[PDB]
Amino acid sequence: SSSCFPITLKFVDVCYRVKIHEERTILSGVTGMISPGEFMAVLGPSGSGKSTLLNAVAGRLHGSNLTGKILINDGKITKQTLKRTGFVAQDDLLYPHLTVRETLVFVALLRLPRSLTRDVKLRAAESVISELGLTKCENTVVGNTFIRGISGGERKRVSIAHELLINPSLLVLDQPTSGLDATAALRLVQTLAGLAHGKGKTVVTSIHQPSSRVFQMFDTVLLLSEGKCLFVGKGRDAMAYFESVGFSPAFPMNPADFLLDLANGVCQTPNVRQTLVTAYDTLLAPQVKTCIEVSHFITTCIATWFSQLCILLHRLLKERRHESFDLLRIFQVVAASILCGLMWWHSDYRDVHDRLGLLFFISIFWGVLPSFNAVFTFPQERAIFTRERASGMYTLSSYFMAHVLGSLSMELVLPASFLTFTYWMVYLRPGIVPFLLTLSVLLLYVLASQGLGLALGAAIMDAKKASTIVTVTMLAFVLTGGYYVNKVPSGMVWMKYVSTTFYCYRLLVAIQYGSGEEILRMLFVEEEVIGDVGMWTSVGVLFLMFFGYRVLAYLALRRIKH
Amino acid sequence: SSSCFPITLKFVDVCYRVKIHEERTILSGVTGMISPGEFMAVLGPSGSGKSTLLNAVAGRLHGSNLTGKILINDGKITKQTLKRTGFVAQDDLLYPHLTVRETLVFVALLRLPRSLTRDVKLRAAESVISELGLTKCENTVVGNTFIRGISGGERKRVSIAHELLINPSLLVLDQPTSGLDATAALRLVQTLAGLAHGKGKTVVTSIHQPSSRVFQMFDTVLLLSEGKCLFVGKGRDAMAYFESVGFSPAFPMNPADFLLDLANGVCQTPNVRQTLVTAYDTLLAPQVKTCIEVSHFITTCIATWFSQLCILLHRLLKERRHESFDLLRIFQVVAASILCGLMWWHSDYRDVHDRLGLLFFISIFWGVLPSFNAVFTFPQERAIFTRERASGMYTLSSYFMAHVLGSLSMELVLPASFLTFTYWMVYLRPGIVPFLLTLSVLLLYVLASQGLGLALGAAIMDAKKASTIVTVTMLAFVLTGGYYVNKVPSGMVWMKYVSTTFYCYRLLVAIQYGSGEEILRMLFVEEEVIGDVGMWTSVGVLFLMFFGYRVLAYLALRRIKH
Numbered sequence A, B: 001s002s003s004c005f006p007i008t009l010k011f012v013d014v015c016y017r018v019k020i021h022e023e024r025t026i027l028s029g030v031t032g033m034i035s036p037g038e039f040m041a042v043l044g045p046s047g048s049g050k051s052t053l054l055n056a057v058a059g060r061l062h063g064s065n066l067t068g069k070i071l072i073n074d075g076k077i078t079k080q081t082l083k084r085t086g087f088v089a090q091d092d093l094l095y096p097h098l099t100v101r102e103t104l105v106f107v108a109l110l111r112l113p114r115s116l117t118r119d120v121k122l123r124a125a126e127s128v129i130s131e132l133g134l135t136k137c138e139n140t141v142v143g144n145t146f147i148r149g150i151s152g153g154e155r156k157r158v159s160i161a162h163e164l165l166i167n168p169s170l171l172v173l174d175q176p177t178s179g180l181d182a183t184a185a186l187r188l189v190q191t192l193a194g195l196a197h198g199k200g201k202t203v204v205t206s207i208h209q210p211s212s213r214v215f216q217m218f219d220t221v222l223l224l225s226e227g228k229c230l231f232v233g234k235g236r237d238a239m240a241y242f243e244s245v246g247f248s249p250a251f252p253m254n255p256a257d258f259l260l261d262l263a264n265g266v267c268q269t270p271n272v273r274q275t276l277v278t279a280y281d282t283l284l285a286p287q288v289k290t291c292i293e294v295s296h297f298i299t300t301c302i303a304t305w306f307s308q309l310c311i312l313l314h315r316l317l318k319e320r321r322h323e324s325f326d327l328l329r330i331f332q333v334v335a336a337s338i339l340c341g342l343m344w345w346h347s348d349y350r351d352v353h354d355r356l357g358l359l360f361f362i363s364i365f366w367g368v369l370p371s372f373n374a375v376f377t378f379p380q381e382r383a384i385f386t387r388e389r390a391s392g393m394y395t396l397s398s399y400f401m402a403h404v405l406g407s408l409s410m411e412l413v414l415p416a417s418f419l420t421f422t423y424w425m426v427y428l429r430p431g432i433v434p435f436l437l438t439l440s441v442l443l444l445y446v447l448a449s450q451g452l453g454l455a456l457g458a459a460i461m462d463a464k465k466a467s468t469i470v471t472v473t474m475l476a477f478v479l480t481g482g483y484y485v486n487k488v489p490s491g492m493v494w495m496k497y498v499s500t501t502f503y504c505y506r507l508l509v510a511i512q513y514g515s516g517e518e519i520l521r522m523l524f525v526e527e528e529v530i531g532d533v534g535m536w537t538s539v540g541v542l543f544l545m546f547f548g549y550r551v552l553a554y555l556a557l558r559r560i561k562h
């Protein structure tokens, strides 16, 4: 009911220039201060630079283009201050397969301060549904362009409640009432004004068509016009200003309509906007800037990480329930396995050259299949992972060990369904011990080759550009794999040791043909089991690749900090 | 300056129900008539069913859920009436790599009636840029979430000018002023009211926060409230209605704020919305329905198709100029080719088993590489192809023969860059005639295998679900390709004739080892060139597959009519 950790936002001489395809100035000398307990509205035409100003003061724009001082409590934007900052963008990026209640319950479980009952977090999640009026669309999905779900004015309020279930100190909303009608925008502005006045927060909105009652609820007003600001001050002090300059309406009208006609160059009675720029820069802006220079300012760390892992994994399983593309994958891999078992039906144990071809086609198949599906994991989560990474929703370790743990359920049943037909139709080395060793080596090789597609795809966050890198990489792995080229040059025999197909192929041949004595009694001293690498330094390098490719996939997602 | 082909839209008792996860009614008994020369505004809260009503009367919603009569000129919605209907949706789907002027010039070149000068079409394209005020953002890109481009209120006006460059008879706009300020929404409503009054069109908007001057510009007003309508009639007749029911404001306020407070259940003085439903259903709706039952109603065909092909192809090249992922593909395929040429450096012409392995790895490589990149062509164009297919922008044949003609530039230089190193480093059969025949067979096999990935991906419009179908399909093509399995069963020797790897492998072996007499003088009567299929019935089946896979890819895109 009372205040919180206060944030005083100060932006001093913010400029932003882009390069044409000289420069053009999107913002040029914006200066203001938003104290705690204040409700600022950023008004302006539809070209001004309001979303770049609100992306600059939320820490979402940075680089060599910005030329200003964004000071949160007289210090720069750290990651410790981006956790108490809630940013509602214009574009609403939500997960399409969860419902509204499943979305807001996951946000309330992740972001609320964790020294609370689960029932208190769920009651806080349903207390913001009833505040924004999301009760009729509570159990409706939040679908895509293709998936028809909730409305477009309910998708905005779901995104607002997404950042109300943080309890932030600085709330930066970019056009929150665009998409709501005349009486839900009034209730939303009443909610935000209650957050600013009662709870002592710092709310910064960019409202675009405010009513005359909605304009009365703002403390300060920043009027923007083509980057250059025209007015910083109280809302009730506007229209007492501009009569010192000489601009007054001919009709009793809305203050926002008049203040947005002046920002375009219309008075409804010759250089109106330049007159207002020169009038703001000499009568109002130094008195603003002298006002802003005088403002001076372990055992549960495992349980939090495991709760984040369980919440992220349970969300990850809730969106693969929408797809029924799991019986087609099984019925096609089983069909390919019946094909591979029927082509080698007349194969015998004594035909070693006929069976090393089968044991190499298995290594081609289960190195090409998982590695080419794993390049869609991280590129298809890019637009939401960037937003929830900039927001500070979770740690990267809990997010990474949920696509890892979420992939180890059907990438272990597809080679197990392949092998139970292909092993016994071809009738390889009989017994439960070689069958289970072949299954273990195949399940290890699938996880080792899946990490290659994870890493190529975390490094290149595009599933089309990564699908041609991983194709040539896996074909180079198949080429230096052991079945092709006889007289390899002496300078290129080292290239098979970085291949992951080589170790699986050597392990399968060593399981099938033992050590090289039970087949030579029956009859291939260089191509089969007699080789250089052993059976324990081939599972060691497969485990090393299984861990190292996921370490590289984690380090490639660590570069995305924005 | 005068009227056009008139459209009288009539929707009679439109209902729409969806299934929960009984039914819920999104719309329930909506009845209205929009004559030519009329400007109707659909008002309502943010759950009503306005976008489903405007998607129903634009022919974009259909199925077993709709239970009404949508009558355009007393006849159902055909494809001949969807060409004079322009629908502006809420979500703006534009191409991200074109600019604003390049977008609107392409729309003006495609949709204007083609018996006109190109300069007249370009002046009409720049006459709608100056009308909507898109002059400062004229040469700025229209980028994605990732690609920062024009603003969000300029992206709305680009989508409105996208449908103003059609000259339609029925203009259905779904929230066109959500995202514009107070003075661009007034100018947009003035533009649409000028189109309705001067040019005799039929404009249907769904406005959401209208001002008091914007409310004066509508002819008829349809007030919606949770599916059931509350008022159909003139805008000036509202607030003279509801005083027959007994609802009048306590303040002199906006008519839209009062009419949207009544649609929620607020009067600002007990069953307000049910009172208004029962008052509309007995005092106003029969007098509406008796008013709507009394309303009674070759050589250039090649040049148009070629102009559409050139416009669509020139747009297709303008977005692959953004990506610089063409030197990485070349520098990786050249690296793989140096790898394949260095592993077979010590290979001789007499080593036939050593060289059939190389000629089969080439057939693996250039059947796995193009076919796995071609599954991203049509799934990555899905959301814009559906919109421009429902709009009627182009024929499907011109759109299909521009991704076909747009892929035949770098899918012909990658095998040509592979082969110029791999042919002369391994030093295969010397001479310009076998080198050019091998290059021709490789360039034909690449185009034949690219069609497999086009068809699997036009049939499954998802690049992740198609990448696992095409992987197992190409691995089954490699398996029944000719190099693996010696003793194939007699019932499975027919499966190699549907493989595309088989014909390329047979043609490469027949080019390298001739007919089977110049190698047997030097020394493989069953595995090399002596085979069943000839050299002319292997290029014939490759041409048949190159044509048939693209015919199937065209017929799979023909199912998407929505």
Ligand SMILES: Nc1ncnc2c1ncn2[C@@H]1O[C@H](COP(=O)(O)OP(=O)(O)OP(=O)(O)O)[C@@H](O)[C@H]1O
Binding pocket: A137, A140, A148, A149, A150, A151, A152, A153, A154, A179, A180, B018, B026, B044, B045, B046, B047, B048, B049, B050, B051, B052, B053
């Ligand atoms: N396919 C669906 N399944 C379930 N509910 C749906 C579906 N489509 C729409 N709805 C619900 O129906 C209502 C109508 O949505 P619609 O988009 O039709 O309304 P709207 O008036 O356009 O809203 P807004 O003004 O906020 O955009 C919304 O509550 C939406 O939640």
Ligand SMILES: Nc1ncnc2c1ncn2[C@@H]1O[C@H](COP(=O)(O)OP(=O)(O)OP(=O)(O)O)[C@@H](O)[C@H]1O
Binding pocket: A018, A026, A044, A045, A046, A047, A048, A049, A050, A051, A052, A053, B137, B140, B148, B149, B150, B151, B152, B153, B154, B179, B180
């Ligand atoms: N990266 C860019 N390159 C070129 N021009 C840009 C870029 N980003 C923004 N602009 C232009 O700068 C202006 C500011 O955009 P911004 O989104 O900042 O304004 P806005 O006030 O939010 O508009 P709206 O109210 O319509 O959403 C717009 O004209 C946009 O065209």
Ligand SMILES: [Mg+2]
Binding pocket: A050, A051, A090, A174, A175, A206, B152
């Ligand atoms: Mg904005």
Ligand SMILES: [Mg+2]
Binding pocket: A152, B050, B051, B090, B174, B175, B206
């Ligand atoms: Mg709508």
